[PDB]
Amino acid sequence: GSHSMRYFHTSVSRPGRGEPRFITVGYVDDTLFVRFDSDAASPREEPRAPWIEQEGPEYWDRETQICKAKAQTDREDLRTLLRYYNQSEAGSHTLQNMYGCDVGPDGRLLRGYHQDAYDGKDYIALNEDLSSWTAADTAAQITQRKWEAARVAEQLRAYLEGECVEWLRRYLENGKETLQRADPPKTHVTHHPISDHEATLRCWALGFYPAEITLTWQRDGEDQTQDTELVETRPAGDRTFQKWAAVVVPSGEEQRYTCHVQHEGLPKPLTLRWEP
């Protein structure tokens, strides 16, 4: 289909309790495939999907080395950010980084990313051109200046257009059993009395992969966007995801309500109703 590879990184300082903890995970679409945690007894990059286990020892050494180097790098960067924002050294702070690529079904680059956040706020992002920077404030403009001087964007672009795309493609082939299978949601509607006067209709989608899905209720064919409780898509623990949407319905109106499900494993959008 269309696919993506993303690496996520979080460093959290903890002054007085040792060096910052560095956790990083890699995904292809919504499948976790590698993880590194600096608090593990023996930190290595570890496999988390079967189709990556076949990579040889040299893969694991190289990936592990990169993780360890970025763990140290983040530690220097967290000390720099204390200077840039004129902060005391007594508090815990967060530095997050995300990078990766999106490809279309033909396997071509649709979009690259490389972005950082500090204390949960955007700091600096590689723009979609993969050549210019968006700095969120005057602290990040100092980074931008250093990165412009060092032609950093050029190096990121080469990774994003080259290795990012080529290895994602390799992974998509090696994990073609799972990564290129969409599991359609299993859908039903349940009925939950609140009082004599109304009841909740809850439309469920279960066992679906990937996570992207649309779940919508209408009444007499009109979207009930403001009266729908839509819960955040959540993992089941078995690779698949779950989601429901609920509306409060006055007694006897149930058949005026229809639930609408769009998902990539469904050849056509579903329509369902409560069935007493």
Partner: peptide
């Protein structure tokens, strides 16, 4: 496969 490039803030 990860980015092997490091760039300090």
């Amino acid at each position: 496969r990860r980015l092997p490039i490091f760039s300090r803030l």
